[PDB]
Curated annotation (Swiss-Prot), chain D:
The RNAP catalytic core consists of 2 alpha, 1 beta, 1 beta' and 1 omega subunit. When a sigma factor is associated with the core the holoenzyme is formed, which can initiate transcription. This is DNA-directed RNA polymerase subunit beta. Belongs to the RNA polymerase beta chain family. DNA-dependent RNA polymerase catalyzes the transcription of DNA into RNA using the four ribonucleoside triphosphates as substrates. The lineage of its organism: Bacteria, Pseudomonadati, Pseudomonadota, Gammaproteobacteria, Enterobacterales. It comes from Escherichia coli O157:H7.
Length: 50, 99, 50, 100, 175
DNA sequence: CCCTGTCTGGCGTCCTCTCACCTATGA
DNA sequence: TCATATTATTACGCCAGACAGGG
């Protein structure tokens, strides 16, 4: 739930390169962040450090 | 109740779609209304087939838009959402409407 | 952690953070709508103790 | 959706399913090894990239599982044995299969 | 003269605390030592509304207001009422009444409860609204259209690909 | 003001194995 | 189902470390 304790737009995506809304999943399309949920399609290891 | 308006040019395809959506409904929910066929729109067109001049020379075309009215009487939690992931075949415009 | 029974026996930290955020949101709402000062003193005591 | 206990199971062949019956549960008396299948169990996956064949297969059988994710019970790695007794308990309302 | 005091109850059983308090008053018949008991008022549901139903209205966060005087007998009476922790004041010997200069301004605000208010709001298409009512509850989407004359924001279930455009009320969906 | 009971906090062995049991409320 | 938020037992044994009391 946004934006409670477990979040997605504070702490990152649950699944790797798996945007909450889902719109970016290309090998030649990395770095751009999401617009719907605004979740930077990166790795889930970043939920261990944010 | 969820009214569903299937529209397509190919009739076989629309039939296939309808059956699919029925299946979707029936496992999750209960008492699917049924696949009711509405009237088909036969939008006709005449055109002059000659480059310059021959008016009696003509081709008459048409587009048969078929309608299928599927209704769902009891919207449960499971059933309505099931359609989100369940997209239908291409060339079939669906139109769900609850209430 | 899931206990494979449809429920989440939560860790103690999420309970503690949830208590702090409940008490803090109620204190923001009580400082918003101009509560009498004895009640916001009590609410700040509760927040300090949480 | 719910799960499946039936023996129509992906990713497996004759050599696993010879020791199961036609409804997933191992026989009473089948002497098994460490790491066979006792109860076959598959959970839902999804269509995701519903292709022409995937969409045609989701309107021919009328079932949406489809390939599924193997989560069958297995003998834990190390122990042999002989299956002596099988119990099946059913929450009321659910369809009893043929072995129940 | 009876002055006001603040009582803390187990938050959630507050109406039952108020009823048990009135009943303990009419049991131990110190009727000349209690005036009123004020609980959960100033309703507003969520946003705006000109009809009934709705409900889910609550402001009182767990405190019970009591018109009272201070004898130690009446103090033991209120703390012997069940599911009551105690008064909230400077000390527990002589607990504290609240004020009186902020009661004149609160009276004018209570008289304007429903006469001329309800300020207007606004919205826009971005990023997506939230549905929490009807079969579309627990779903998000975007408002392609926003009829301000019919007060109906056209938001489609926005299924990944091609969903269907429905109409939800402002309270039916969340921003 | 230097002894002094008195009170408050802070320790208390490593490694392993088996089993069961898990917040209430509620218009 | 979806926000509301904390009360009616005692039964270790030193051993430092800080504190109000009093000759």
């Amino acid at each position: 739930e946004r934006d409670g304790l477990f979040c997605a737009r504070i702490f990152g995506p649950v699944k790797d390169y798996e945007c909450l809304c889902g719109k970016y999943k290309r090998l030649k399309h990395r770095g751009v962040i999401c617009e719907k949920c605004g979740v930077e399609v990166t790795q889930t290891k970043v939920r261990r450090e944010r | 109740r969820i009214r569903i308006r299937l529209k397509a040019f190919d009739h076989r395809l629309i039939d296939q779609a309808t059956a699919e959506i029925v299946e979707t409904a029936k496992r999750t929910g209960a008492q699917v209304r049924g696949p009711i066929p509405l009237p088909t729109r036969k939008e006709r067109f005449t055109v002059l087939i000659s480059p310059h001049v021959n008016k009696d020379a003509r081709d008459q075309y048409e587009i048969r838009t078929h309608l299928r009215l599927v209704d769902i009487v009891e919207p449960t939690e499971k059933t309505v959402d099931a359609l989100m992931r369940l997209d239908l075949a291409a060339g079939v415009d669906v139109q769900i409407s609850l209430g | 952690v899931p206990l494979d029974g449809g429920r989440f026996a939560t860790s103690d930290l999420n309970d503690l953070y949830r208590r702090v955020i409940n008490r803090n949101n109620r204190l923001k709402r009580l400082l918003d709508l101009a509560a009498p000062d004895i009640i916001v003193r009590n609410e700040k005591r509760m927040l300090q103790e949480a | 959706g719910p799960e499946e206990i039936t023996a129509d199971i992906p990713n497996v062949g004759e050599a696993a399913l010879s020791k199961l019956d036609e409804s997933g549960i191992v026989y009473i008396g089948a002497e098994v090894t460490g790491g066979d299948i006792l109860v076959g169990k598959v959970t839902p996956k999804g269509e995701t990239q519903l292709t022409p064949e995937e969409k045609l297969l989701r309107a021919i059988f009328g079932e949406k599982a489809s390939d599924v994710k193997d989560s069958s019970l297995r003998v834990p790695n190390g122990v042999s044995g002989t299956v002596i007794d099988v119990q099946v308990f059913t929450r009321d309302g659910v369809e009893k299969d043929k072995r129940a | 003269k009876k002055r006001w005091y603040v009582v803390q109850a187990f938050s959630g059983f507050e109406g039952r605390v108020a009823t048990s308090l009135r009943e303990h008053i009419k049991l131990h018949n110190m009727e000349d030592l209690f005036g009123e008991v004020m609980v959960p008022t100033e309703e507003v549901v969520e946003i705006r509304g000109g009809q009934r139903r709705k409900s889910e209205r609550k402001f009182f966060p767990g405190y019970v207001l009591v018109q009272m005087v201070m004898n130690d007998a009446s103090w033991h009476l209120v703390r012997s009422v069940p599911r009551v922790m105690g008064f909230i004041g400077g000390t527990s010997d002589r607990p504290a009444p609240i004020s009186d200069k902020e009661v004149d301004a609160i009276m004018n605000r209570l008289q304007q409860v429903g006469d001329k208010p309800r300020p207007k709001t606004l919205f826009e298409p971005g990023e997506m609204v939230r549905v929490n009512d009807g079969p579309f509850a627990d779903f998000n989407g975007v408002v392609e259209e926003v009829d301000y004359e019919k007060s109906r924001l056209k938001v489609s279930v926005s299924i990944f690909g091609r969903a269907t455009p429905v109409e939800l009320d402002f309270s039916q969906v969340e921003k």
